[PDB]
Amino acid sequence: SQSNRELVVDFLSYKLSQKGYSWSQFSESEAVKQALREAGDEFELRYRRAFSDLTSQLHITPGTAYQSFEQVVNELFRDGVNWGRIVAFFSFGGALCVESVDKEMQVLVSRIAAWMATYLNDHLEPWIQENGGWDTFVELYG
Amino acid sequence: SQSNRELVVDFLSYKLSQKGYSWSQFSESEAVKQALREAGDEFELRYRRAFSDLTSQLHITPGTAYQSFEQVVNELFRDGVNWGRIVAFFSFGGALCVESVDKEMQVLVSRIAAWMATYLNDHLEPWIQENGGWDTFVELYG
Ligand SMILES: *S(=O)(=O)c1cc(C(=O)O)ccc1-c1ccc(F)cc1
Ligand SMILES: *S(=O)(=O)c1cc(C(=O)O)ccc1-c1ccc(F)cc1
Ligand SMILES: [Br-]
């Protein structure tokens, strides 16, 4: 896609790495990526329980449709968009990739990356642009 | 206060009662009280980890100032006010009351109720009025 696609790929590469997997076998910009990597690790520590209940709701098979992903991701934004909720979303996507590689369905990695870039573009990009862009996120979270 | 104090007391009475403690031994409107009651239970269940990190932050001794409670509660509104964070606020106060009764400092329950009411008035009331009052919380969470 574009700059959102590039952000999704960086985050998923990091999440995969933390679990010992490489992206290569599946295929302010620096400050945005670093800040989002750090924000996702923090969110994963603080909301261990609630996050586990989220990831439980979706088990990605080669048959899962994007709409099934949207329905659970939509729960994160029920009451609107915010940075914490966008971080949760990245984290969520990262956990589905890890789960995918764990179950030897490494083909779903590029599929989740596409689903995420799409979801950011369609639903989150207007609120992001309206709230200072990714540079604001960095100034707030870096 | 007013509706806020009535809301605080109902919520605190409910929480204490759940653990087997009466409010009486220390001292649409129904749809709101009920909706908040249910929200507080669901919240306490969903954020097992995160809620525990917050309650840990303040251990109320009869010499704890309001400014102390306020500083830990500002942590709940760090990145803005939303219905969910207001629900976390009520749940937190409920925990500080159950904690006071259990730690033999059952006198504190009345002061917590007063701290909660003031916080709502000084900080939370404009956001509540701007987002359609408690009837909107009901018409969403109820
Ligand atoms: S949570 O209360 O932070 C929350 C709130 C919403 C909402 O729409 O109000 C959506 C999602 C979440 C959430 C936070 C943390 C998680 F691990 C999962 C969901
Ligand atoms: S979170 O636990 O970091 C958090 C963050 C904010 C914020 O404004 O950044 C507000 C509330 C919370 C929180 C949610 C749920 C809990 F049980 C405890 C804290
Ligand atoms: Br949690």
Swiss-Prot record, chains A, B:
Motif position, BH2: 126-141
Tissue specificity remark: Bcl-X(S) is expressed at high levels in cells that undergo a high rate of turnover, such as developing lymphocytes. In contrast, Bcl-X(L) is found in tissues containing long-lived postmitotic cells, such as adult brain.
Effect noted on mutating D135A: No effect on caspase-1 cleavage
Key words of the record: Apoptosis, Cytoplasm, Cytoplasmic vesicle, Cytoskeleton, Endocytosis, Membrane, Mitochondrion, Mitochondrion inner membrane, Mitochondrion outer membrane, Nucleus, Phosphoprotein, Synapse, Transmembrane, Transmembrane helix, Ubl conjugation
Position of sequence motif BH4: 3-23
Impact after mutating D102A: No effect on caspase-1 cleavage
Position of sequence motif BH1: 75-94
BP GO terms, sorted: apoptotic mitochondrial changes; apoptotic process in bone marrow cell; cellular response to alkaloid; cellular response to amino acid stimulus; cellular response to gamma radiation; defense response to virus; dendritic cell apoptotic process; dendritic cell proliferation
Domain of life: Eukaryota
Effect noted on mutating G94E: No heterodimerization with BAX
Function: Potent inhibitor of cell death. Inhibits activation of caspases. Appears to regulate cell death by blocking the voltage-dependent anion channel (VDAC) by binding to it and preventing the release of the caspase activator, CYC1, from the mitochondrial membrane. Also acts as a regulator of G2 checkpoint and progression to cytokinesis during mitosis. Isoform Bcl-X(L) also regulates presynaptic plasticity, including neurotransmitter release and recovery, number of axonal mitochondria as well as size and number of synaptic vesicle clusters. During synaptic stimulation, increases ATP availability from mitochondria through regulation of mitochondrial membrane ATP synthase F(1)F(0) activity and regulates endocytic vesicle retrieval in hippocampal neurons through association with DMN1L and stimulation of its GTPase activity in synaptic vesicles.
Summary of subunit composition and partner proteins: Homodimer. Interacts with BCL2L11. Interacts with BAD. Interacts with PGAM5. Interacts with HEBP2. Interacts with p53/TP53 and BBC3; interaction with BBC3 disrupts the interaction with p53/TP53. Interacts with ATP5F1A and ATP5F1B; the interactions mediate the association of isoform Bcl-X(L) with the mitochondrial membrane ATP synthase F(1)F(0) ATP synthase. Interacts with VDAC1. Interacts with BCL2L11 (via BH3). Interacts with RNF183. Interacts with GIMAP3/IAN4 and GIMAP5/IAN5.
Domain notes: The BH4 motif is required for anti-apoptotic activity. The BH1 and BH2 motifs are required for both heterodimerization with other Bcl-2 family members and for repression of cell death.
Protein name: Bcl-2-like protein 1
Organism: Homo sapiens (Human)
Residues of the full protein shown: 2 to 196 of 233
